[PDB]
Amino acid sequence: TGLSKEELLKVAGSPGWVRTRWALLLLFWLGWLGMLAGAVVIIVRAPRCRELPAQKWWHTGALYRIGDLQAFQGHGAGNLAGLKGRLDYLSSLKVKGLVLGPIHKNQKDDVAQTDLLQIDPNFGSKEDFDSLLQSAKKKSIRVILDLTPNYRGENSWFSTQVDTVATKVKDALEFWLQAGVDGFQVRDIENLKDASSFLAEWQNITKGFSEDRLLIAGTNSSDLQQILSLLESNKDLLLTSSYLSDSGSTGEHTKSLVTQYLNATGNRWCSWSLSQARLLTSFLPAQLLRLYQLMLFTLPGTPVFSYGDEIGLDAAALPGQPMEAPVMLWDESSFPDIPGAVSANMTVKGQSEDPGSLLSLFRRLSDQRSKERSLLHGDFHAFSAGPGLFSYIRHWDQNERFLVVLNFGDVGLSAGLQASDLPASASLPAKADLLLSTQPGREEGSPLELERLKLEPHEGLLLRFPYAA
Amino acid sequence: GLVSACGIIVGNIIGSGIFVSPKGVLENAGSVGLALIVWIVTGFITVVGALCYAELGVTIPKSGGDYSYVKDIFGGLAGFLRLWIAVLVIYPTNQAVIALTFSNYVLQPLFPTCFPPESGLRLLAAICLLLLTWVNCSSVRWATRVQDIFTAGKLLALALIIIMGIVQICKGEYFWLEPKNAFENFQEPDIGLVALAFLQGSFAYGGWNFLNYVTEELVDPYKNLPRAIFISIPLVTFVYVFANVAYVTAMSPQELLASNAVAVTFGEKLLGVMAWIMPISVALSTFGGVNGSLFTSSRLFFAGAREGHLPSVLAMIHVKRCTPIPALLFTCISTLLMLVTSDMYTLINYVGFINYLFYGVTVAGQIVLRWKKPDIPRPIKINLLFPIIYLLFWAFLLVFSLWSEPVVCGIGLAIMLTGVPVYFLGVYWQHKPKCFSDFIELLTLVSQKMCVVVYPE
Numbered sequence: 002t003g004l005s006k007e008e009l010l011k012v013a014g015s016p017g018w019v020r021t022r023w024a025l026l027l028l029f030w031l032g033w034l035g036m037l038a039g040a041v042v043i044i045v046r047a048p049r050c051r052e053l054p055a056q057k058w059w060h061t062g063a064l065y066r067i068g069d070l071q072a073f074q075g076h077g078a079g080n081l082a083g084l085k086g087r088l089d090y091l092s093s094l095k096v097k098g099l100v101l102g103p104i105h106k107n108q109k110d111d112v113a114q115t116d117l118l119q120i121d122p123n124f125g126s127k128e129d130f131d132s133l134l135q136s137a138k139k140k141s142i143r144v145i146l147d148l149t150p151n152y153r154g155e156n157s158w159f160s161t162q163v164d165t166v167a168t169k170v171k172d173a174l175e176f177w178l179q180a181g182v183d184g185f186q187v188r189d190i191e192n193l194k195d196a197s198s199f200l201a202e203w204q205n206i207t208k209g210f211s212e213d214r215l216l217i218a219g220t221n222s223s224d225l226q227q228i229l230s231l232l233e234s235n236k237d238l239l240l241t242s243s244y245l246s247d248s249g250s251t252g253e254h255t256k257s258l259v260t261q262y263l264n265a266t267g268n269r270w271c272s273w274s275l276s277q278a279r280l281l282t283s284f285l286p287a288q289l290l291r292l293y294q295l296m297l298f299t300l301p302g303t304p305v306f307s308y309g310d311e312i313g314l315d316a317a318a319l320p321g322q323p324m325e326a327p328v329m330l331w332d333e334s335s336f337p338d339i340p341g342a343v344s345a346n347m348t349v350k351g352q353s354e355d356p357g358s359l360l361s362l363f364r365r366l367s368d369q370r371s372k373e374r375s376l377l378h379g380d381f382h383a384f385s386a387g388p389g390l391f392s393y394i395r396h397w398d399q400n401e402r403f404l405v406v407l408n409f410g411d412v413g414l415s416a417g418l419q420a421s422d423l424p425a426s427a428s429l430p431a432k433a434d435l436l437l438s439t440q441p442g443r444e445e446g447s448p449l450e451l452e453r454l455k456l457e458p459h460e461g462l463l464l465r466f467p468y469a470a
Numbered sequence: 471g472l473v474s475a476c477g478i479i480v481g482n483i484i485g486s487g488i489f490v491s492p493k494g495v496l497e498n499a500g501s502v503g504l505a506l507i508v509w510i511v512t513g514f515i516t517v518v519g520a521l522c523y524a525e526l527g528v529t530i531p532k533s534g535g536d537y538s539y540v541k542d543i544f545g546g547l548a549g550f551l552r553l554w555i556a557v558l559v560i561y562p563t564n565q566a567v568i569a570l571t572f573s574n575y576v577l578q579p580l581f582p583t584c585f586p587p588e589s590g591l592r593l594l595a596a597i598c599l600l601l602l603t604w605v606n607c608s609s610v611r612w613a614t615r616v617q618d619i620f621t622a623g624k625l626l627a628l629a630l631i632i633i634m635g636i637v638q639i640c641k642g643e644y645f646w647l648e649p650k651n652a653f654e655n656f657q658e659p660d661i662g663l664v665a666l667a668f669l670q671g672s673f674a675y676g677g678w679n680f681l682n683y684v685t686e687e688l689v690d691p692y693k694n695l696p697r698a699i700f701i702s703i704p705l706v707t708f709v710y711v712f713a714n715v716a717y718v719t720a721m722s723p724q725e726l727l728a729s730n731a732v733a734v735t736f737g738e739k740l741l742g743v744m745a746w747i748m749p750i751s752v753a754l755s756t757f758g759g760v761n762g763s764l765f766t767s768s769r770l771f772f773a774g775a776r777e778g779h780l781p782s783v784l785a786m787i788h789v790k791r792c793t794p795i796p797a798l799l800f801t802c803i804s805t806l807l808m809l810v811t812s813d814m815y816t817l818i819n820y821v822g823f824i825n826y827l828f829y830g831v832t833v834a835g836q837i838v839l840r841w842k843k844p845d846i847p848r849p850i851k852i853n854l855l856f857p858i859i860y861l862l863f864w865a866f867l868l869v870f871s872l873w874s875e876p877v878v879c880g881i882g883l884a885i886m887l888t889g890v891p892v893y894f895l896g897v898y899w900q901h902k903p904k905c906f907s908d909f910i911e912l913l914t915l916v917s918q919k920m921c922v923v924v925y926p927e
C-alpha cells in the first residue's frame with residue numbers, strides 16, 4: 002500500500018506530463034484508425050467465392066427405376082396400394098426419385114384399344130395412386146411415370162399410323178400432370194421416326210407447366226453422334242442410353258468414353274446410367290459391381306438405377322426367372338420356388354447387417370452425394386495416367402475437395418501421379434486421408450502418402466483433402 | 471419487488487451465448503434429439519447450482535462474490551486462485567469469444583459460401599475491443615446510457631426468432647425431426663462427445679455466480695429469493711429451447727454444422743428484407759456483452775485489493791469521471807493476447823472447463839460447512855438431495871472431458887499450478903534485502919503520473 006496521496010499528486014502534476022499524456026492519447030486514435038483502414042483493405046483484397054448454379058431437385062440423389070410392381074413386392078402384395086410399405090425403405094437409400102412403371106391400359110399390341118389416361122385395375126385405382134402421392138411428398142421423394150404405350154409387344158410404338166400416338170400423349174401430359182406428378186418418362190425412341198421433333202413438342206409443354214418438371218428419354222444406342230442428333234435442340238433433356246454399356250474391359254476405353262462425351266457436349270447436365278432399363282448384372286461380370294457404384298456416384302450427373310442394382314440381383318445366377326422382371330429378394334421366403342436356393346448374401350436384411358456388403362456400400366455412397374457440395378455440382382478434371390487406371394479430381398471453389406482413383410485392371414498397379422492438367426488452385430498435396438474403399442483392407446480415416454499408393458485389382462478409392470491454404 | 475427482481479435475473483442471463491452455441495451443441499451431440507436434451511438438462515442442473523449459491527450467500531453475508539466464499543471456508547491458497555483465474559482466463563476469454571462472434575456475424579452476409587479471411591477476423595475483434603475500452607475509460611454515465619440500447623438490440627433479435635418460429639410451425643409442418651418418421655441418430659455419440667455438449671451449452675447460462683446478491687440490496691424482498699429463481703431460470707430455458715427449435719424448422723442440420731454465423735442464415739432463408747435486421751441486431755447484442763463484462767471486472771479489482779493481494783497499482787480511480795483506468799487496461803491488454811487462436815469453439819471449451827472447476831469446489835465447500843462447523847443461524851435451508859446430484863454431475867463432466875482432448879483442458883489445470891509459486895512470494899516472504907520492494911514502490915507512483923488516478927477513501 003505504498004502509494005502517493007491525492008493532494009501530494011496534484012502538486013507533482015508537471016507540465017512535462019501534460020505533453021506526455023496528450024501525445025500518448027493521440028497514439029491510440031492513430032493505432033485504431035491504422036487498424037480500421039487495414040481491415041477494409043483486406044475485406045476487398047480477399048478473393049470472393051462463386052455463386053451457386055441454382056440446381057433443381059434432380060441434381061441430388063439418384064433416380065430409382067421400378068419396372069413391374071408385381072415383381073417388386075411379390076405375389077399378393079403386388080398391388081399399387083402395397084407400395085407405401087416400401088417408402089420407408091427407399092428413404093433409407095436417400096433416393097430422390099421414383100421412376101414408376103407403365104400402369105395404363107393396353108391389352109396386347111392394340112393401337113385402337115389403348116389409353117394412357119386411366120390406370121389399369123390390376124394394380125390399383127385413381128384413389129389408390131393419390132394415396133401414394135400423399136406419402137411421396139411426405140418423405141421428400143418425387144415420382145415419375147413410364148409412358149410407353151405398347152409396353153407388351155416388341156415394337157413399343159404401335160407400328161401402324163403415327164397420328165394416334167401423338168394426340169393422346171398430349172392429353173396424358175396435361176391430365177396426369179395436373180394431379181401433381183413430378184415429371185414423365187418415355188423410352189425406346191429408336192422405334193420412333195422424327196422423334197427429335199416429337200420430344201421437343203413434349204419438352205416444351207412439360208417445362209411449360211412448371212420449371213421443376215423433366216422428361217427422361219431413353220434409347221438403346223451406343224453412338225456418340227446419334228444422341229447428339231437428339232440433344233441438338235433440347236439441351237435440358239435428361240437423355241439415358243446404353244452408351245457406357247460396351248464390351249470394353251480396358252481402363253483407357255471408359256476414360257476416353259466419358260472424356261469425349263463430356264467435351265463434345267461441353268459441361269452440361271447428363272444422366273450417367275449404364276443401360277436403358279436393364280440391371281447391372283447383365284452387362285457386368287460378378288466382381289465388378291462393387292466398382293461401378295463408386296464410378297456412377299462421382300461422375301457429374303444424375304445416376305439412374307433400377308431395382309436390385311444395390312444388392313446384385315442377378316438373373317444368370319438363377320434359372321427359371323424372367324429377364325423382363327425378376328423378383329426382388331426381401332428374405333428367404335421371397336423366392337418360394339426352391340427352398341435353400343437363395344442364401345444370406347442375396348437378401349435385404351442380410352446385406353443390411355454386414356457393413357462390408359453391397360447394400361451397405363450403396364447406403365454409404367448416396368449419403369456422400371446428397372449432403373456434399375463438391376460431388377453435387379463441382380468441377381470434373383481427369384488425369385492423363387499410364388495403364389488402365391481411371392482417376393480424376395472433383396472440386397468446388399473452396400469446399401473440401403474430393404479425389405477418386407480406381408483400378409480397372411486385373412493386375413496390381415502403382416500410383417502414377419499426374420498433375421499439370423489442373424489449374425494452380427487445385428493441386429495434389431502429399432497427404433490425403435481415405436474416406437471409403439471398396440475392398441476393406443485398411444482403416445478408414447488413416448491418411449497416407451499419394452506417391453506410395455499401391456492398388457489391388459478390382460478396387461477403388463474415395464479420397465478427401467481440404468482446401469490447402 | 472418480486473417481478474422486477476425476477477426480471478433482472480432473466481434480463482441478464484440472456485446474452486450472446488445463444489448465437490454460437492447451437493453450432494456447437496449440435497456437432498458434439500450427433501443428432502438433434504440429443505441436442506435438445508442438453509438444453510433441458512443444463513437448465514435443470516443450473517437451478518440446482520443457483521439454489522445452492524443462495525444458501526452459502528445468506529449465511530456468509532459478505533460482498534464480492536465467489537472470492538468472498540472460498541476464503542471463509544477453504545484456506546488462503548484456494549481462496550486466492552478464484553481471484554487469480556477470474557482475472558486471467560475467465561474474464562479475458564468471456565470477452566474474447568463475445569468479440570469473435572461479432573466479426574463472424576458481420577463477414578457472413580458478405581462471404582456466404584466461402585469461409586472468411588482468417589487474418590481479417592482478428593482485426594474486427596481488435597476494434598470492438600479498443601472502442602469499448604475507451605468508452606468505458608471515459609465517464610461512467612456513458613457506460614450505461616448505451617448499454618440499455620444493447621438490450622434493445624438483443625431483444626429485437628430474439629423476439630424476431632421467437633415469432634418467425636411460430637409462423638413456421640403454423641404455416642409449415644409439425645416437429646419435422648421427430649422420432650416417428652424422421653430423426654435418425656446417424657452419428658451416435660459416446661463418453662467423450664456427449665459431455666462436450668454440456669461445456670458449450672453452459673456458456674449461454676453464465677451470469678448467476680455473482681448475479682443474484684446484487685438483487686436483495688435494492689428493494690429487500692425478504693427471503694422470496696429462492697422463490698424468485700424457480701420462475702426465472704425456466705423462463706430462460708423455454709426461450710432457449712424454443713429458439714433452437716426455430717432453427718431446424720428453417721434449415722437442415724447438414725447446414726447448421728456448415729455455417730459459422732447461425733442466426734444470419736436463419737434470417738436470410740425466411741424474409742425478403744434482410745441484412746439490416748438480423749446481422750445488425752446481433753452485432754448490436756455482442757457489444758453489450760463486451761461492455762457489460764468489462765465494468766463487471768471492476769468490482770473484482772476493488773474487492774481483490776482489500777484482503778491480502780492484487781497490489782495497489784490496480785484498484786485506483788480517476789479523480790474526475792471516476793472509472794478505474796489502470797484496472798480496465800489489465801483486461802484489455804490480456805484479452806488481445808488471447809486472440810491468437812485459430813478457432814472459437816476451442817475457446818468455449820477452455821472457459822467452460824475451469825468454470826466448472828469452481829462450480830464444484832464452492833459447492834463442495836457447503837458439504838464441508840454442513841459437516842464441520844454446523845449450527846449457524848440460517849434463513850433459508852435447502853435439502854441435501856440437491857448438492858449431491860451436482861457433485862456427481864460435476865464428477866463425470868471433468869473425467870470425460872479430460873479423456874477427450876487433454877490439451878485445451880490440460881492447460882486449465884496448468885494455469886492454477888502457476889499460482890502455487892505465486893502464493894509463495896506475495897504474503898509469505900521475508901523482507902530482508904529490501905531490494906525488490908522499492909521497485910513495486912516505483913512503478914506504482916509513476917503510474918499515478920501516467921494516468922491521474924488515486925486511491926479511494
Ligand SMILES: C[C@@H]1CC[C@@]2(OC1)O[C@H]1[C@@H](O)[C@H]3[C@@H]4CC[C@H]5C[C@@H](O[C@@H]6O[C@H](CO)[C@H](O[C@@H]7O[C@H](CO)[C@@H](O)[C@H](O[C@@H]8OC[C@@H](O)[C@H](O)[C@H]8O)[C@H]7O[C@@H]7O[C@H](CO)[C@H](O)[C@H](O[C@@H]8O[C@H](CO)[C@@H](O)[C@H](O)[C@H]8O)[C@H]7O)[C@H](O)[C@H]6O)[C@H](O)C[C@]5(C)[C@H]4CC[C@]3(C)[C@H]1[C@@H]2C
Binds near residue numbers: 432878
Ligand atoms: C500470457 C498468457 C500465457 C498463457 C495463455 O494466456 C496468456 O496463453 C494463451 C494462448 O497461448 C492459448 C493457446 C493458443 C493456441 C491454442 C491452439 C489449440 O490447438 C492446438 O494447436 C496446436 C498447434 O501446434 C496442436 O495442433 C497440432 O499441431 C501439430 C504441430 O505442432 C500438428 O502436427 C497437428 O496436426 C497434425 O499434423 C500432421 C497431420 O498428418 C495430422 O493429420 C494432423 O493431425 C495439430 O493437430 C491438430 O490441431 C488442430 C488445431 O490446430 C485440431 O486440434 C486438430 O483436431 C483434430 O483433427 C482431426 C482431423 O482428422 C480430427 O479427427 C480430430 O477429432 C480432431 O481433434 C488436430 O489434428 C494442438 O494439438 C492443438 O490442440 C489448442 O486447443 C489451445 C491453444 C494451445 C490455446 C490454449 C490456451 C492458451 C495457452 C492461453 C493461456 C491462458
Ligand SMILES: *[C@@H]1O[C@H](CO)[C@@H](O[C@@H]2O[C@H](CO)[C@@H](O)[C@H](O)[C@H]2NC(C)=O)[C@H](O)[C@H]1NC(C)=O
Binds near residue numbers: 205
Ligand atoms: C416453348 O414454346 C415455343 C415452342 O418452341 C417456343 O417459344 C417461342 O415460340 C415462338 C413462336 O412464335 C418462336 O418464334 C420463338 O422462337 C420461340 N422461342 C424461342 C425459340 O426463342 C419455345 O420453344 C418455348 N418457349 C420459349 C419462350 O422458349
Ligand SMILES: *[C@@H]1O[C@H](CO)[C@@H](O[C@@H]2O[C@H](CO)[C@@H](O)[C@H](O)[C@H]2NC(C)=O)[C@H](O)[C@H]1NC(C)=O
Binds near residue numbers: 222223
Ligand atoms: C436396339 O436394340 C435392338 C435389338 O438388339 C438392335 O437391333 C435392331 O433392332 C431394330 C428394331 O428394333 C432393327 O430395325 C435393326 O435392324 C436391328 N439392328 C440390327 C443390328 O439388326 C438395335 O440395333 C439397337 N439400336 C441401336 C441404335 O443399336
Ligand SMILES: *[C@@H]1O[C@H](CO)[C@@H](O[C@@H]2O[C@H](CO)[C@@H](O)[C@H](O)[C@H]2NC(C)=O)[C@H](O)[C@H]1NC(C)=O
Binds near residue numbers: 264265
Ligand atoms: C476437346 O478438347 C480438345 C483439347 O482441348 C479440343 O481439341 C482442340 O481443338 C482445337 C480446334 O481444332 C485446336 O485448336 C486445339 O489445338 C485442340 N487442342 C489442343 C490443345 O491441341 C477439342 O476440340 C475439344 N472438343 C472437340 C473434340 O471439339
Ligand SMILES: *[C@@H]1O[C@H](CO)[C@@H](O[C@@H]2O[C@H](CO)[C@@H](O)[C@H](O)[C@H]2NC(C)=O)[C@H](O)[C@H]1NC(C)=O
Binds near residue numbers: 342343344346
Ligand atoms: C455367399 O458368399 C460366399 C462367400 O463369398 C459364397 O461362398 C463361395 O462361393 C463361391 C462361388 O463360386 C465359391 O467358388 C466358393 O468356393 C465359396 N466359398 C465357400 C467357402 O463356400 C457363397 O456361394 C455365396 N452364396 C451363394 C448362394 O452363392
